Amino acid sequence: QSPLAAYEVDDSTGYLTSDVGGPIQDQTSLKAGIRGPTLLEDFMFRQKIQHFDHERVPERAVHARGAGAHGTFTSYADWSNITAASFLNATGKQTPVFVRFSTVAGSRGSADTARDVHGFATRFYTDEGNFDIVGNNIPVFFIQDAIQFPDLIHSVKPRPDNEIPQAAAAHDSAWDFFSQQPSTMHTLFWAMSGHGIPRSYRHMDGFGVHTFRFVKDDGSSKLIKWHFKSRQGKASLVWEEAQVLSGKNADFHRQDLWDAIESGNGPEWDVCVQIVDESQAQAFGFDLLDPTKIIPEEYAPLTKLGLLKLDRNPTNYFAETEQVMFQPGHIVRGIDFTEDPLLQGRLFSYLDTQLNRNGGPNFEQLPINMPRVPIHNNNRDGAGQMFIHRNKYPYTPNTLNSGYPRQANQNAGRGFFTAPGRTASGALVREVSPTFNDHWSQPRLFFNSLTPVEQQFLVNAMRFEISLVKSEEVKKNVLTQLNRVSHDVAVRVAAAIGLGAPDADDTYYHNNKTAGVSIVGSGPLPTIKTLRVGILATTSESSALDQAAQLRTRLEKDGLVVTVVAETLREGVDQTYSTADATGFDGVVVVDGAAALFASTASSPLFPTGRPLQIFVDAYRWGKPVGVCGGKSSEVLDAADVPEDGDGVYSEESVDMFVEEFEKGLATFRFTDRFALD
Amino acid sequence: SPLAAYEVDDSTGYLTSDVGGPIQDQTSLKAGIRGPTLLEDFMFRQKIQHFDHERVPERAVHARGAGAHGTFTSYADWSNITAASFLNATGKQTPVFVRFSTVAGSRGSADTARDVHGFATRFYTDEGNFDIVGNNIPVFFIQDAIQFPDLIHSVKPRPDNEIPQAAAAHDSAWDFFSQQPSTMHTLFWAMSGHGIPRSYRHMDGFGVHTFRFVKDDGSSKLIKWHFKSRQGKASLVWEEAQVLSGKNADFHRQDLWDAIESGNGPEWDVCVQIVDESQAQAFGFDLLDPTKIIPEEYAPLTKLGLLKLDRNPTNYFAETEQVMFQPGHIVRGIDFTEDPLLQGRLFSYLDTQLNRNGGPNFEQLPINMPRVPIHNNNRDGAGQMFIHRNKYPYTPNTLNSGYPRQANQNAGRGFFTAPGRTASGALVREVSPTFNDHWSQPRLFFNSLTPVEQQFLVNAMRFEISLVKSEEVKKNVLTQLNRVSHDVAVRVAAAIGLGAPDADDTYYHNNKTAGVSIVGSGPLPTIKTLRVGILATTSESSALDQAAQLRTRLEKDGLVVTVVAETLREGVDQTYSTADATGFDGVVVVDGAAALFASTASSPLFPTGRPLQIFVDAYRWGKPVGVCGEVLDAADVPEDGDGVYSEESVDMFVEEFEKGLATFRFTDRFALDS
Amino acid sequence: QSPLAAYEVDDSTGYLTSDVGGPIQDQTSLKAGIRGPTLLEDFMFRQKIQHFDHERVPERAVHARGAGAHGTFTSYADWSNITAASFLNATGKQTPVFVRFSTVAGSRGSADTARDVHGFATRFYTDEGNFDIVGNNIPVFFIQDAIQFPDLIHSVKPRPDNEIPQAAAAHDSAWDFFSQQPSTMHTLFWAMSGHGIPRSYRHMDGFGVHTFRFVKDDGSSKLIKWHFKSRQGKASLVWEEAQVLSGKNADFHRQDLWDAIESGNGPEWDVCVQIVDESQAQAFGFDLLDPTKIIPEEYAPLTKLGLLKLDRNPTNYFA
Ligand code: HDD
Ligand code: HDD
Ligand code: HDD
Ligand SMILES: [Ca+2]
Ligand SMILES: [Ca+2]
Ligand SMILES: [Ca+2]
Ligand SMILES: [Ca+2]
Ligand SMILES: [Ca+2]
């Protein structure tokens, strides 16, 4: 049973009714005569059409495009030695969760595979209240003060005269903002890396970004960072793949997640923290209140608290995924805020914005937002009020309700409490802390920590986007900021856009590196289960279908998702060449019985000219494992200009030997030697 | 019940947020003990955001009202006249919720304004919710729903200064009545005692429109709904209503609440008039015209079942403020008619709930939910509380095996339009000439009132029209009233210093009809719940003894007794300072309190002359009054008076007084025109 | 002409139109025959009734019952010696105002003459932005922390099972809260005095209640209290009179104000402050941050800043 089974409505049987249970029809209007006008007294028509007319709600102001699933969090230990948080207070303690992943800039119909920051928002339905960690797949944020959020978001969203371009920072306004607001450099470098185009929601991490506090029942506190570390491994698309995939399958990430859960491959993350003392706020060479900075893992290692597993898809997307209303204000005893001016302002935004989405104040009553423990408070009325409150004296202090509900605090009722060592001192100021002023060292730290091909991909992303900026003042200003992180980056980017990079400014240049931020560097994937193999076959040769069937059995044994492609559907063929694309596969195999489909003269009314070969070629050029199974590889590899001796290029007669080799190629995931370097 | 499932108990436990996190809510989080409040105080903001958003728009009409739960019980299997499931078996019980209301006043306006009153009943039937959205007056002001904003704008406050509240006593309203002669019939009802009912329990309910009863063979008859009070018909007098407006704006809602808590839940016989389709234009008017009644002489009432209200709400806002009635809530066995007022209502009540609820899922509110399964392809919308398992919500489908199934006359107990219904003719914005007699039935109503009732109606018109500033509107009002009755126009004209126009006898007649008079409806069938004020004193132990003896003799018979004295103690319920004659249906002075009634009497504990003014007001307003055990001389009240009691004995005082409570009003105390 | 003349719509001439300017009728529904059913294609009907169906907005959560007027504020001096405020920077400088007066507990159709605290909310449409002083006719408030406001208001508003009683603190819940929350005593005594039943909005004062700051252009600050002193005089009803007036004329205060303006007797207040140093926050025997306390005038006299005069009634109450 779903955790929301009490709210489910079954329509597998029965006669149509109105919303008030009156049996009706809904297929023909009531008319004055068989060719007559429709009657106002047709309530069947008007209740159905009113409902339809009002189906839509405002999309989220940011993160409008996303997808969610149910699962379970399991604690690895009793963490009462660092936090009073009930959901962390025992080894094996289980708490239901709901997670939504998202992009940031695009509207709710935009492509999953846009280049962007991604959301990773987790609700823990704890036995002491709902606790939300509203995170991103990038551990740092663009800006240092919440009051700037509309500036950032206006600049990266479409230009407001014509609403162009969708789901993209590749326009003047965005790069104007980045180059005028240098705090943006750290997140910008992350977004221009493969972290901007993750392979799936399952192949990315989650970060709380802000420093938070863990608070013990004795009132002592520690400073923490949340890290959700993918047990699937880290992987990226390449940009020229992501662009085609945005058109061929705008739903790629939500389909990948849905399919993984349905196949019993529900994705997993270790929920981890960095834990440091209050005295270390300004010990690591930056301010822990500054959300543009990471704590390098060399300074503070990750502690694994527990397992997050997503294993149940929603029943109704709108009701569960569209309506889930996360808040960092959803906090529990044992956790506290910090004076990070970005986190501080968020606490206001997420309570207010639900009024816009829900249209009224009772949004916590929606099934997906309800807690799994009793609610005792004097909140009342409001549009859409579902509860029927018995307590006729909803004020404190009272005698006529015997003093209930009772106040909860540090000493009674397991109340939330502010960390009691927290203080404030000084002038009431609209001033930025000078401790926040180094906007360039950590972007350089990140860039330094990427592999050479990874550095090239980041340069190439900047070359792509900045070449689309029309303004020559903005392009020059961008090169001024990039040059403060890396003169080499500025020179390489400047080469694509026909400007000269400004002279080196070495104030913030350094050669330090940090582990765990590189994708290319994180080694082969720990599992290839769920990865997608396209087998290109033909109906023109019964032996090509036999090769494909033998390949399927052997690949499916290992938990790969196999698609057999041919000219037309039949038993054992999943997909036509017409609907197939290399963006649909993590590796491509041609059965040598189909080699004739790869000829330059090959033509069919059943698929676009050159489609079989284009699938193989795109897969090779995008770095995927590719091969020909059966022993006759020359005709295909030569048509594709693919060298038989290439890394991640497989040619074997033996199906078993083909699959053993090819499976190592899928774990490698990308063959980076196929990309040119400056 | 959807209601039982959503009840929230806060009789124990620690305070939590709406997401179950234990919190406090009495002190703001601050930067130091004398410091500014922090934005990160989520406890503060969630509490104050909820408070800031508590209010919803009041209803566009009938904003002021009160509701209760109960049961409807069928007297029979009515299959012979309707397919309606709630009427298909002797003793069949259906839960109900009723809301009673005024019309013009906003949410906080007085119950005892002079107005039309709502009487809206939801039957939570086993074939869907069925609402009869009625009033206490059987005819409506206008003949086409498109005119409703014109009527309501005219009766509601003038829109430059929003004056006056809950009152038709202003130029705009009487401008409308005089220019729109269809208004005359309801205007005469509202100017009668029906404008100021004694309680919701002492008025009837009417569907107003002709509806149809439709059998499972497809045949139809025309019907009128009448809910006939078992408590009897009773009114206030106008002065009393005005004082009550100030002393207790909650009088009708308190009366209803208290009757239910005391086990005196009000009852009505749910009745219909039934006539054949061929009789639509047989009674001298059009049954599509909502300004006309069928005289009971032409079509008697058939009793279908018992409506009883016997449980108060748990949360007023969630149940009473949020109940969203609709004539569109119809069930198989009932159909509409081509009454142009009913026709347009059907649109209004679906649309307006979007304004009140702020989103389209208002039928999901517990008070709006049915008591049977919902099966349909309505989806999404703000505030969606369901999780629909059918992922193919379209018809026709194969992917959900063709469910839900279409319901119609043949199968699934579908609603169906009466299959004898037709339309013929041009597409017109034309009024039927059959609707054009605006004056005969107002005169029938006026003729059917007793002489003192006719005087009260003339005096209500004298009161309101005298407050009309425009001499031209007042003349136009007399022109219209004169077409109903020259005598009424002459008597009204005398109060405002104008001459009545010459008699215009076109619509004059001397016909009468039973069952519309209050004064004529005879003694109340029960005195239970009626209020007796016993005026006593703490001075004399004999006065308190006398009051306690009367108390036991009257409470025996189900009377709500208030003993009044200078100060509270054991046996005294109320001080003279808080007491008023509008609080009582009868007033008894114990002779031991004689000293309080002298003109010389004064106290810092109550206003000068309060005890005598309660007795004198009760007398002037027609109520049974008496002394048990000087007082009558002070009050200038004659001992021989009808409804004036003077007994040394408590037993014989009471036996006599209780006959007076049943009589209810002594109308010989009101002056008549010569 | 009104300060809002640019937004006015004249209907003293012309033919009925839809909201998009199409001439129409609005007195008979379109029907399939003269005794027929109403047609869905009747857009004249639906646009008109849709508008009607959606006329209402939520009443204010408190102070739902009230009435307003336009007028003018005129500064008596250049107050740059104590504040940078532009509306106070020159003798004779005029700023348009709008004021709304109100009760607190009653819903928008409740009687003006209920016993209650009253609102006095003033907008100054200044040449450096709108400045509102949202005050009451009593200088002290029931509670010392905004987080308690729903507690106070739930207790004073009708009991939530039956919504009784209207516009009145005369019920168990209110006196339960007063007796358990002793901060309430000062405002309670004011509300139980004639200040709870003023003769008119014109015969009551306005108070900011809180200590605010006046800030000079040089950055220095002083602590102030706002006091709007009635030029009409202070006057009350007696309680028995108020109870009868509630029934005989629920609109008494709004009519009194409307009529005073139409007769050329637009009400006036001297807009005054008490001015004390920051060092005097705890000097008077109580804390100036505590909204349950007044500064006795014997400790800090009133300085007259300017004249507030209300002299124009609204054109559309709702708008
Ligand atoms: C001051 C405003 C502001 C700031 C500074 C941020 N956000 Fe935010 N965010 C919002 C204002 C907001 C919002 C407008 O309140 C949204 C839109 C929908 C919602 O519920 O909240 C939101 C949505 C939103 C979602 C989507 C949740 C879901 O799937 O429904 C995620 C994952 C984040 N944000 C994450 C972040 C992170 C990791 C930030 C910086 C560390 C951040 N936001 C800063
Ligand atoms: C064309 C519009 C229109 C017309 C002609 C009428 N009404 Fe109506 N009425 C409404 C439009 C409306 C409304 C605006 O839709 C309301 C306000 C709140 C609601 O639910 O519906 C309403 C409320 C309302 C209520 C209050 C229900 C409750 O307690 O919540 C009652 C009892 C009635 N009406 C009764 C009548 C009767 C007996 C009428 C004539 C026979 C009538 N109305 C004509
Ligand atoms: C924490 C909430 C809160 C607190 C502590 C107060 N109020 Fe308030 N008040 C509101 C929350 C509110 C509100 C809910 O926000 C209202 C309802 C309508 C509106 O615009 O604001 C309001 C309305 C309102 C109005 C009506 C304005 C109008 O005519 O439209 C006045 C005069 C006051 N208040 C005056 C005060 C005074 C003098 C207070 C104490 C010194 C006070 N309020 C405390
Ligand atoms: Ca742009
Ligand atoms: Ca990469
Ligand atoms: Ca008027
Ligand atoms: Ca109470
Ligand atoms: Ca006084």
Coordinates of C-alpha atoms and ligand atoms in Angstrom, one line a residue, chain B residues 58-63 65-66 98-102 117-120 132-135 137 139-140 142 144-149 206-209 290 320-321 323-326 339-342 344-353 356, chain C residues 45 49 52-53, ligand 2:
Chain B
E58 CA -19.0 36.1 2.3
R59 CA -21.8 34.7 0.2
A60 CA -23.0 37.3 -2.5
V61 CA -26.5 37.0 -0.9
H62 CA -27.6 35.2 2.3
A63 CA -24.3 36.1 3.9
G65 CA -27.1 32.6 8.4
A66 CA -26.8 29.6 10.6
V98 CA -29.9 23.0 6.6
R99 CA -28.8 26.6 6.5
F100 CA -31.2 29.5 7.3
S101 CA -30.3 33.1 6.5
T102 CA -31.4 36.7 5.7
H117 CA -35.1 34.5 4.6
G118 CA -33.2 31.5 3.2
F119 CA -34.1 27.9 4.0
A120 CA -31.6 25.7 2.2
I132 CA -33.6 22.4 -2.2
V133 CA -32.4 25.9 -2.0
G134 CA -35.6 27.7 -0.7
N135 CA -36.8 30.8 1.1
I137 CA -41.6 33.3 1.2
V139 CA -42.7 33.8 -4.4
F140 CA -39.7 35.8 -5.6
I142 CA -38.3 39.0 -10.3
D144 CA -35.8 36.3 -14.9
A145 CA -32.5 35.4 -13.2
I146 CA -30.7 38.0 -15.4
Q147 CA -32.3 40.7 -13.3
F148 CA -30.9 39.3 -10.0
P149 CA -27.9 41.8 -9.8
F206 CA -40.5 27.0 -0.1
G207 CA -38.8 25.8 -3.2
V208 CA -40.6 28.8 -4.9
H209 CA -40.2 27.4 -8.5
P290 CA -42.0 32.4 -9.8
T320 CA -21.9 26.3 8.1
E321 CA -19.7 29.0 6.4
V323 CA -21.6 24.6 2.9
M324 CA -22.0 25.3 -0.9
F325 CA -25.7 24.7 -1.9
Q326 CA -26.7 24.4 -5.6
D339 CA -39.0 29.1 -15.1
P340 CA -36.5 31.8 -16.3
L341 CA -35.5 32.5 -12.7
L342 CA -34.7 28.8 -11.9
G344 CA -30.3 31.1 -14.6
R345 CA -29.8 30.1 -10.9
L346 CA -28.4 26.8 -12.2
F347 CA -25.4 28.7 -13.7
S348 CA -24.9 31.0 -10.7
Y349 CA -24.5 28.5 -7.8
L350 CA -21.8 26.4 -9.6
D351 CA -19.8 29.6 -10.6
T352 CA -20.0 31.4 -7.3
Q353 CA -18.4 28.6 -5.3
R356 CA -15.9 31.5 -2.1
Chain C
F45 CA -26.5 36.6 -19.1
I49 CA -24.0 36.9 -13.5
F52 CA -22.3 39.3 -9.7
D53 CA -21.2 35.9 -8.4
Ligands
HDD2 C1 -29.0 34.4 -10.8 C2 -28.7 34.4 -9.6 C3 -29.6 34.0 -8.5 C4 -31.0 34.1 -8.4 C5 -32.0 34.4 -9.5 C6 -31.3 33.5 -7.1 N1 -30.2 33.3 -6.4 FE1 -30.1 32.3 -4.5 N2 -28.0 32.6 -4.6 C7 -27.3 33.0 -5.6 C8 -27.8 33.4 -6.8 C9 -29.2 33.6 -7.2 C10 -25.8 32.8 -5.5 C11 -25.0 34.1 -5.7 O1 -25.2 31.8 -6.3 C12 -25.7 32.3 -4.0 C13 -24.7 33.0 -3.0 C14 -24.0 31.9 -2.3 C15 -24.3 30.7 -3.0 O2 -24.0 29.6 -2.8 O3 -25.2 31.0 -4.0 C16 -27.2 32.3 -3.6 C17 -27.5 32.0 -2.3 C18 -28.9 31.6 -1.9 C19 -29.1 31.0 -0.6 C20 -28.3 30.7 0.6 C21 -27.8 29.2 0.6 C22 -26.9 29.0 1.8 O4 -27.5 29.1 3.0 O5 -25.7 28.9 1.7 C23 -30.5 30.8 -0.6 C24 -31.4 30.1 0.4 C25 -31.0 31.2 -1.9 N3 -30.0 31.7 -2.6 C26 -32.4 31.1 -2.3 C27 -32.9 31.6 -3.5 C28 -34.3 31.4 -3.9 C29 -35.3 30.7 -3.1 C30 -34.3 32.1 -5.2 C31 -35.5 32.3 -6.1 C32 -36.5 31.4 -6.1 C33 -33.0 32.6 -5.4 N4 -32.1 32.3 -4.5 C34 -32.6 33.3 -6.7

